[PDB]
Amino acid sequence: VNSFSGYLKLTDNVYIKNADIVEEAKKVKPTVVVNAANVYLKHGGGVAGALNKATNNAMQVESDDYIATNGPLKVGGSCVLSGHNLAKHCLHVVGPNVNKGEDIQLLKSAYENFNQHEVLLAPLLSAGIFGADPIHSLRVCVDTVRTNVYLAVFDKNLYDKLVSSFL
Ligand SMILES: Nc1ncnc(N2CC[C@@H](Oc3ccncc3)C2)c1Cl
């Protein structure tokens, strides 16, 4: 038993809710919240901009030190940093950005990072401003992640389409 509430169960291990991941994170304090990161950990907009704003820019400060030491992430890669006031840890995961021309096949590699964590609160990777189809992202999630994932979908209209079209 865990503290996630109001989720619809899609599979043995994937759950989905119409929720703001920031508000969801502040209430649940999950062990891991996933950020929709880019390789530079520049948290300017979308999920990343929202999560970072909720940390009063502490996520960005930590991220800039990470990049100065380690260099950029790979598309499809991840790093574990602090969850600040939102979670114990933040798993920064880089899905391919279609608006930058990145290969969509890298979406599966991106979701594989979730398997290193038993339970996660996450957005749909490569959705929103990353330009991929969220229905495809949900399919890849279900077919790749084996650990327990709680997906927060900000847009109610999108949440209803994802559920109604789920196979
Ligand atoms: N998945 C998302 N994609 C893009 N923007 C989002 N947010 C939530 C509200 C606002 O973010 C904050 C964050 C901290 N204080 C007030 C508002 C935009 C989200 Cl939740």
From Swiss-Prot:
It is a multi-pass membrane protein. Inhibited in vitro by GRL-0617. Residues 1-167 form the Macro domain. Changing T31A: In strain: Mu/B.1.621. It comes from the Viruses. It catalyses: Thiol-dependent hydrolysis of ester, thioester, amide, peptide and isopeptide bonds formed by the C-terminal Gly of ubiquitin (a 76-residue protein attached to proteins as an intracellular targeting signal). It is found in: Host endoplasmic reticulum membrane. Responsible for the cleavages located at the N-terminus of the replicase polyprotein. Participates together with nsp4 in the assembly of virally-induced cytoplasmic double-membrane vesicles necessary for viral replication. Antagonizes innate immune induction of type I interferon by blocking the phosphorylation, dimerization and subsequent nuclear translocation of host IRF3. Also prevents host NF-kappa-B signaling. In addition, PL-PRO possesses a deubiquitinating/deISGylating activity and processes both 'Lys-48'- and 'Lys-63'-linked polyubiquitin chains from cellular substrates. May form homohexamers. Interacts with N protein. This is Papain-like protease nsp3. It comes from Severe acute respiratory syndrome coronavirus 2 (2019-nCoV).
